[PDB]
Structure 1
Amino acid sequence: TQQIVPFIRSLLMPTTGPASIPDDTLEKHTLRSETSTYNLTVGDTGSGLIVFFPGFPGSIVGAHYTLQGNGNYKFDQMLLTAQNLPASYNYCRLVSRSLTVRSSTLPLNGTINAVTFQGSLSELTDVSYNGLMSATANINDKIGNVLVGEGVTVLSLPTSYDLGYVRLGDPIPAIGLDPKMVATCDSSDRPRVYTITAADDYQFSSQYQPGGVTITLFSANIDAITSLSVGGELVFRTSVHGLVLGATIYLIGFDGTTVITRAVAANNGLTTGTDNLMPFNLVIPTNEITQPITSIKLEIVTSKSGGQAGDQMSWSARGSLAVTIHGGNYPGALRPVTLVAYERVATGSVVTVAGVSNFELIPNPELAKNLVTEYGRFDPGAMNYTKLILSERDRLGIKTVWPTREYTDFREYFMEVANLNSPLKIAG
């Protein structure tokens, strides 16, 4: 270590400030840091879960959920950046990030368990306080029973560099008749695609009922935080006359609550001996998503025009759907997820979250008039040193989740050289 490599200093200690990433991605950008401060309130059970998205290239930092008496979680609020980046910048890239979770007030207060899972939120098999501990085999990606008073620090380690600049959900110039009109240029690069074969000649059969018979064709776990779109088509075949179908797609949250409900086809009559097409042309905007989506399901209501006591309704469906979450496969947008769970904490106490997030940004047309952009500072060996450090990650003890006390000791063990400036003022 000669002095200190700006990037490494930033990667390991985000609270220090931003630094350009030493990869081959050469863009004229600007560096900024955004703080995240939140004072969460503990529920009745005294247990909760904070879902962090350490690699998210934007202002969405995470989401808080409180555990309830019945065992289910309840969405509280989204953890964001001090200010909304998309309102001022168009393109973004994540450099480093660290967050600390600890208790600050009391009405001494429980413990914390945390892990860094290498997958999206819905892919987790167990999200219970104790279950987390087995989300990864990596020992430096998990930490157990840390006193809340002490706190836990979440460090964001990379999941591949040389990633392109992600476009934020910035508002694009537009005018409309509707006051609630929203037009944005969303994160598209590197989209994730879920392919659900809802039915392959599925035989439906049930007796008549006033109001209709409702069934849930399928229910799969998908993940989404920002805009997504659903495409595909289901074909229905029938022998019975006068059958009317009703289809609705539900986007469910982590807490099991319905986040978004869209009617795919309401009041659709079926013709006998012919293919009845039911297209899916859903486009869900970012502002409509109030909390991370965890699963998607489709309900189909079958009703008859006439109807008696026992008419036996029946149809055959065949078709596949394609759920496409824009920019979903971009490393960090959904991929790495760090969970910080706490329990036994006093009811009514405050759990404080404080962090810093560093980005490489490109201002929007208006701000670009006064914001100067430049190419990254050049310093060879920065990337090599980073690769070296990451290579010896386990033997250096560089964790993704740390007990704040240990992280503070790491901040002084490391960064031992801050030698002001050698004879430059006495140089001549």
Structure 2
Amino acid sequence: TQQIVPFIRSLLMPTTGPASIPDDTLEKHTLRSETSTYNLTVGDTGSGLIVFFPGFPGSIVGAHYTLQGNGNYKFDQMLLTAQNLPASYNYCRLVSRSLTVRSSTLPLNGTINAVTFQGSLSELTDVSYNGLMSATANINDKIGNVLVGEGVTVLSLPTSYDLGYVRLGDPIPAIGLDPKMVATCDSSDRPRVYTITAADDYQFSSQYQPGGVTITLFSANIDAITSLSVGGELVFRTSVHGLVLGATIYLIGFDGTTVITRAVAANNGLTTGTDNLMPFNLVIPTNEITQPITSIKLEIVTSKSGGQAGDQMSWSARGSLAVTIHGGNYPGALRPVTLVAYERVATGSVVTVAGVSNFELIPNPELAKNLVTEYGRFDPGAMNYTKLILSERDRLGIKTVWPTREYTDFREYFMEVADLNSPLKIAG
């Protein structure tokens, strides 16, 4: 520390403002801060979960779920940046981010558990208040039973530098006959791909039914916050004449709710002694994803034209699907997740979220006319200092989740120099 190092200051105290990342990604950019402010209402059980995406390169900060009588979560709302970055910028990179979670009202109240998990949302094996505590072995990535009144601070720590600029989901110039037409340029670099072999000569056998017989061929945990696509093909064989197949893909939210439902093939006759192809050509736009996607499943309906008492409908199925979630493997886009769980909070009280997110940004064409961009400030040793700090992360006690009181202490313990500027004022 001398004066200090703008980037370290920004990284460890994001509410302080942005600084350019001192890596090798030399783009002309501009630096911005976006606040997040939410007043969430506590449900009947007095318990709930905030899912944060600490590294998300853009306006999505997290999602809030209340816990319900029956032990299920129920989606409340997305937690966003104050304004929608893709409306003004085309490219983006996360510099630093911190968020605060505490109670502010009573209609001395409940506790919080928090973890930073090194995987995407659907990968967590246990998301209960208590179960959170073992999502990492890292002591500085979990905090237990912090009083809600005092609150918790979530600090975003890096998962890789020299990251590319991410395209935001920015609207692209387009005209179309449909009012509800939407055209964007999506986060794409570093896609995540899931491959699901749904069937390898899977035999299906069942008696006839008016209305048909529905099965769930498979269900698989995947993650999506933004646009994705499904490709691939199932091949069906049969000895039985006049079978008609229906198939639907469901994308399921964290709360078990159907987020998106897409008929992949409806009313589709099967021919005897031949391959019957069922292609998958699904594109799911960002705006359709009303809450984080947690799993995908495929249902198949089998029915017969004629039909009787005992008819026995049978088919064989083979094939694999590929689920590409665009930009999904970009560190921060899905990957690190910070969960903040609260319980025993009085029903009707307010859980207050306040955060600052800092970005390197490239303006969209209209803003670029009035927004000057520059290469980052050069200070050598900024990156080495960051590397040193992170290297000593555990001995310094630099947490991703803090009791706010401890984070406040840390701020003043660190940051003991901010020294005006000695004789520039008297120099010459």
Q: What band does the TM-score fall into relative to the shorter chain?
A: over 0.9
Tell me, in whole angstroms, the C-alpha distance in 1 between the residues paired with 2:394 and 2:211: 61
Pairing 1:346–2:346 present: yes
Per-residue CA deviations over 1:326-364 (Å, capped at 9, x if unaligned) read 000000000000000000000000000000000000000
1:259-307 CA distance string (max 9 Å, x none): 0000000000000000000000000000000000000000000000000
| Per-residue deviation, residues 135-194 of structure 1 (Å, max 9, x unmatched) | 000000000000000000000000000000000000000000000000000000000000
- Structure 2 residues without counterparts, runs of 5 or longer: none
Instruction: Could you tell me which runs of 5 or more consecutive residues in structure 1 were left unpaired when the two chains were aligned.
Output: none
Quote the offset at 1:94 in angstroms: 0.2
Q: Matched residues in 2 for 1:35 and 1:416: separation?
A: 25
Query: What is the CA distance between 1:216 and its match in structure 2?
Result: 0.2
Q: Which residue of 2 aligns with 1:26?
A: 26
1:208-248: CA deviations, max 9, x gaps? Answer: 00000000000000000000000000000000000000000
Give the whole-Å Cα distance in 1 for the aligned partners of 2:419 and 2:79. Answer: 37
Cα distance in 1 for residues equivalent to 2:400 and 2:276:
52
* Distance in 2 between residues matched to 1:235 and 1:419, nearest whole Å: 71
SS in 2 for 1:149: coil
For residue 411 of structure 1, report the CA deviation from its aligned partner. 0.5
SS of 1:315's partner is strand
CA distance in 1, matches of 2:158, 2:250: 34
- Structure 1 SS opposite 2:268: strand
Aligned residues: 428
TM-aligned CA deviation for residue 422 of structure 1:
1.0
Listed one character per residue, the Cα deviations across residues 346-400 of structure 1 (whole Å, up to 9, x for unaligned) are 0000000000000000000000000000000000000000000000000000000
Aligned to 1:405: 405
Give the structure-2-normalised TM-score. 1.00
In the TM superposition, residue 108 of structure 1 has moved relative to its aligned partner by: 1.5
Q: Which runs of 4+ in 1 moved over 4 A?
A: none
Q: How does 1:1-400 map to 2 (within 5 A)?
A: 1-400=1-400
**What is the TM-score of this pair, normalised by structure 1?**
1.00
Distance 1:378 1:301 in 2: 62
Structure 1 residue 419, shift from structure 2 partner: 0.6
Identity among equivalent positions (%) equals 100
SS of equivalent residue, structure 2 residue 28: coil
Root mean square deviation of aligned Cα: 0.2
Secondary structure at the aligned position of 1:176 is classed as: coil
Give, in whole Å, the separation in 1 of the partners of 2:229 and 2:340: 30
1:257 deviation in Å?
A: 0.2
Q: What displacement does 1:249 show? A: 0.2
Separation (CA, whole Å) in 2 of partners of 1:129 and 1:71: 11
Measured against aligned partners, the alpha-carbon deviations of 1:75-113 in whole angstroms (never above 9, x if no partner) come to 000000000000000000000000000000001110000
- Rounded to whole Å, the distance in 2 between the matches of 1:250 and 1:301 is 14
Distance 1:94 1:56 in 2: 7
- What is the alpha-carbon distance in structure 2 between the residues aligned to residue 107 and residue 299 of structure 1? 45
Q: Secondary structure at the match of 2:411?
A: helix
